[PDB]
Amino acid sequence: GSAPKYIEHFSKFSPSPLSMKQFLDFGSSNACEKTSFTFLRQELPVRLANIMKEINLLPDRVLSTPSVQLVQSWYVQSLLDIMEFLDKDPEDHRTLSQFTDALVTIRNRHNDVVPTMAQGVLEYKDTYGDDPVSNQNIQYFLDRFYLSRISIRMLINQHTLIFDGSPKHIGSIDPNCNVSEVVKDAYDMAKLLCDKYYMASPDLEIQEINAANSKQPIHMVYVPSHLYHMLFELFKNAMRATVESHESSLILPPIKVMVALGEEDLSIKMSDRGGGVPLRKIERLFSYMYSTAPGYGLPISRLYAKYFQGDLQLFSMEGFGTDAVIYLKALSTDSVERLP
Amino acid sequence: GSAPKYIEHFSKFSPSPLSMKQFLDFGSSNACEKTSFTFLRQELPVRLANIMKEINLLPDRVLSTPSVQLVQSWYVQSLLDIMEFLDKDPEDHRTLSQFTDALVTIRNRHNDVVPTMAQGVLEYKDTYGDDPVSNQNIQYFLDRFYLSRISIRMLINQHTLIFDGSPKHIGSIDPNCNVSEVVKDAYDMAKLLCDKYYMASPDLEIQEINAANSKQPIHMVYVPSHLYHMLFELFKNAMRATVESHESSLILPPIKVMVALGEEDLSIKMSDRGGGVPLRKIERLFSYMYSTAPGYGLPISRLYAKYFQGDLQLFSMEGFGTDAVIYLKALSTDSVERLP
Numbered sequence: 001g002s003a004p005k006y007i008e009h010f011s012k013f014s015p016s017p018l019s020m021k022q023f024l025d026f027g028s029s030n031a032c033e034k035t036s037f038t039f040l041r042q043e044l045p046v047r048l049a050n051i052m053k054e055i056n057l058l059p060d061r062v063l064s065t066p067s068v069q070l071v072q073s074w075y076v077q078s079l080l081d082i083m084e085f086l087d088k089d090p091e092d093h094r095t096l097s098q099f100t101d102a103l104v105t106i107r108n109r110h111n112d113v114v115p116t117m118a119q120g121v122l123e124y125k126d127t128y129g130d131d132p133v134s135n136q137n138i139q140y141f142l143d144r145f146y147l148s149r150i151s152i153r154m155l156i157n158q159h160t161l162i163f164d165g166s167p168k169h170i171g172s173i174d175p176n177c178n179v180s181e182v183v184k185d186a187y188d189m190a191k192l193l194c195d196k197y198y199m200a201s202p203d204l205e206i207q208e209i210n211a212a213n214s215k216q217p218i219h220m221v222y223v224p225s226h227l228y229h230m231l232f233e234l235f236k237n238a239m240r241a242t243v244e245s246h247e248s249s250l251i252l253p254p255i256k257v258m259v260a261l262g263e264e265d266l267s268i269k270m271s272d273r274g275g276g277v278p279l280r281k282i283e284r285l286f287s288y289m290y291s292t293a294p295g296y297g298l299p300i301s302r303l304y305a306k307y308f309q310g311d312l313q314l315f316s317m318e319g320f321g322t323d324a325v326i327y328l329k330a331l332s333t334d335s336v337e338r339l340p
Numbered sequence: 341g342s343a344p345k346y347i348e349h350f351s352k353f354s355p356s357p358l359s360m361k362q363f364l365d366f367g368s369s370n371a372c373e374k375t376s377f378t379f380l381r382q383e384l385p386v387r388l389a390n391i392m393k394e395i396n397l398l399p400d401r402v403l404s405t406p407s408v409q410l411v412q413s414w415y416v417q418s419l420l421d422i423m424e425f426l427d428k429d430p431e432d433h434r435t436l437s438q439f440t441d442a443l444v445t446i447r448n449r450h451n452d453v454v455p456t457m458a459q460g461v462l463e464y465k466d467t468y469g470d471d472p473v474s475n476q477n478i479q480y481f482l483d484r485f486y487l488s489r490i491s492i493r494m495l496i497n498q499h500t501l502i503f504d505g506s507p508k509h510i511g512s513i514d515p516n517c518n519v520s521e522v523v524k525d526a527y528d529m530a531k532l533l534c535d536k537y538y539m540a541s542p543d544l545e546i547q548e549i550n551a552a553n554s555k556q557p558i559h560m561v562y563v564p565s566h567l568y569h570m571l572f573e574l575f576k577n578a579m580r581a582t583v584e585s586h587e588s589s590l591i592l593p594p595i596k597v598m599v600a601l602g603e604e605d606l607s608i609k610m611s612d613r614g615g616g617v618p619l620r621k622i623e624r625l626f627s628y629m630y631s632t633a634p635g636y637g638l639p640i641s642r643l644y645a646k647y648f649q650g651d652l653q654l655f656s657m658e659g660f661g662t663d664a665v666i667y668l669k670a671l672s673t674d675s676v677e678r679l680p
């Protein structure tokens with residue numbers, strides 16, 4: 001075939017990071033379906049090829065595993081699926097409708113990549129060992145591989161949600177996202193799960209700090225689904241710790257949350273009283289290898305934050321509790337894609 | 341001379357990290373003055389030589405500067421000053437008393453190294469530029485150079501304080517150090533300085549969390565002078581921010597401090613409401629190059645924490661305030677020297 005040729009060609013191009021403004025303008029109306037088709041038929045191959053080339057540069061002990069080869073198979077098939085539209089006519093609406101349907105198939109084809117790549121980490125641990133150097137090499141690749149996946153799925157979802165059929169939300173982006181509302185939604189979901197497994201759930205306490213406009217609700221341009229995922233994973237760990245640490249007690253400390261809006265950053269602290277974690281083991285929380293056993297929520301949650309020039313940091317105090325801050329860019333002009 | 345020969349010989353030996361227990365046993369009584377003399381006459385050259393060899397492996401643009409050469413001069417002179425005692429007799433008390441006096445001279449000879457090395461950073465900035473790669477290379481060396489200085493001064497102070505003339509404190513180590521008392525002492529000093537420059541000072545609030553012994557005062561084996569230095573620098577920055585941020589307000593938020601004692605870590609959080617720092621600029625607080633202008637308190641404060649397997653981490657929220665946690669090892673068995 002020509003798959004090694006396509007990868008070599010499109011790997012010479014560099015991924016083009018986009019800004020929240022560019023995302024909003026790409027989906028301003030339905031007349032830009034042809035501009036997105038002309039852009040995605042060239043951008044998606046570049047991003048798919050750049051990561052495919054790094055996969056092929058992995059050590060043979062990792063590359064020959066059935067997991068890496070099954071994922072590499074999907075990427076090749078999705079690349080070729082997009083090759084077909086490079087010569088078609090944007091003016092023909094049938095070319096556009098078939099492109100949208102093709103992206104949905106590519107999206108469902110890669111919907112089980114995180115579990116598949118997790119099976120490979122477990123295989124490597126039991127096949128070669130859990131060496132400190134093996135952790136960094138696997139951390140380096142998975143952080144870049146998962147961040148690339150998030151970028152490709154963002155492009156696909158922005159096209160299949162805006163350019164389907166015929167606005168408050170511009171696809172997956174909400175230009176007036178109330179952070180507190182997403183915090184409550186994530187807490188309510190974790191509460192339902194915690195109330196059924198432990199028969200007890202900590203309460204919630206939200207506090208907003210709008211520095212330049214005191215008492216003005218905090219809004220931002222962001223992907224609420226990504227913020228929900230990060231907050232949902234943090235709440236689950238905070239509740240399990242708050243409950244399991246007070247099983248022999250009657251007081252159940254609440255999970256407090258602070259939303260602060262500055263001139264450049266929008267932070268979301270989350271505090272609990274779960275007995276903290278020793279500093280020596282804090283690295284294991286964001287480690288794919290040390291989080292594998294016969295979940296990648298926190299490692300991937302930090303990638304969702306870094307996807308738009310953010311970060312997710314943890315700082316605990318053994319004997320008391322743990323804190324978690326989601327650092328986001330408050331301004332849309334600074335919210336640009338971070339691509340590997 | 342033979343200085344390049346001594347460096348080559350003693351650079352083949354590796355620095356021997358010591359534990360709090362070993363420090364306590366070395367100064368248990370005055371009968372160990374000869375055991376410390378036999379140990380320090382061999383250990384100090386090794387530590388002095390290992391850092392001197394890294395200084396000589398620096399780039400010529402940094403090595404030829406007058407600052408690096410003035411410090412390199414002091415190190416060579418101190419090495420030679422210790423060479424003289426390698427052949428003397430430990431049984432002769434005059435050999436011991438002259439060794440103590442020699443260490444005091446070496447201590448006062450290197451008492452102005454941090455300012456001298458800071459002048460070199462400023463010279464480099466104005467001579468070659470403040471490049472991101474230049475920051476990491478200077479950060480890598482100064483962190484290791486200053487940490488080596490702290491280790492050498494710890495050995496010297498433990499000998500000149502225990503073996504002088506003829507116990508609650510074992511030299512600079514307090515086997516029953518109340519963390520809260522050191523926090524109050526550091527706050528009181530920063531309050532006096534803040535009350536004179538700003539005519540206003542935030543208040544203090546301490547809370548202890550002894551997990552295994554609730555309401556039992558928290559004590560540890562540590563060097564109170566090192567803990568005072570770290571807390572004193574953090575209080576100064578927290579007060580300036582709390583005051584300068586509320587100059588147009590009447591409420592002056594307090595600086596809260598949490599002391600937590602776990603099974604492995606002893607943490608000291610310090611919170612303020614000074615308007616926080618953007619995440620993009622948090623790295624500048626611990627950067628020697630970005631903290632230089634025509635202080636190294638925070639960078640060196642983090643080294644004092646890492647000296648015994650600790651750490652000092654900062655996490656801010658722009659628009660609200662900043663938090664600082666001093667991570668220390670609660671158990672003496674885990675408090676071992678971290679040497680470059």
Ligand SMILES: Cc1nc2[nH]c3c(C4CC4)cccc3c2cc1-c1nnc([C@@H](CC(=O)N[C@H](C)c2ccccc2)C(C)C)o1
Nearest residue numbers: 234237238240241270271272274276277281284322323324
């Ligand atoms: C006590 C505890 N507080 C925690 N609070 C957390 C927060 C809140 C928002 C600030 C966010 C993210 C993680 C934790 C977390 C973990 C643990 C914890 N406890 N053990 C562990 C180990 C890993 C592990 O097995 N983690 C499972 C999922 C877990 C078990 C019990 C409670 C919570 C998580 C570690 C020592 C390597 O981490």
Ligand SMILES: Cc1nc2[nH]c3c(C4CC4)cccc3c2cc1-c1nnc([C@@H](CC(=O)N[C@H](C)c2ccccc2)C(C)C)o1
Nearest residue numbers: 574577578580581610611612614616617621624662663664
């Ligand atoms: C607002 C502010 N809160 C702060 N709170 C701090 C804490 C407390 C215990 C948790 C510890 C250590 C440092 C800060 C700190 C710095 C600044 C700050 N503000 N600007 C800066 C710049 C550097 C600088 O010039 N720092 C001077 C010494 C300073 C000026 C005014 C207040 C405090 C320090 C930075 C953007 C690169 O850092």
Ligand SMILES: [Cl-]
Nearest residue numbers: 110111113149
């Ligand atoms: Cl994927």
Ligand SMILES: [Cl-]
Nearest residue numbers: 450451453489
């Ligand atoms: Cl020195």
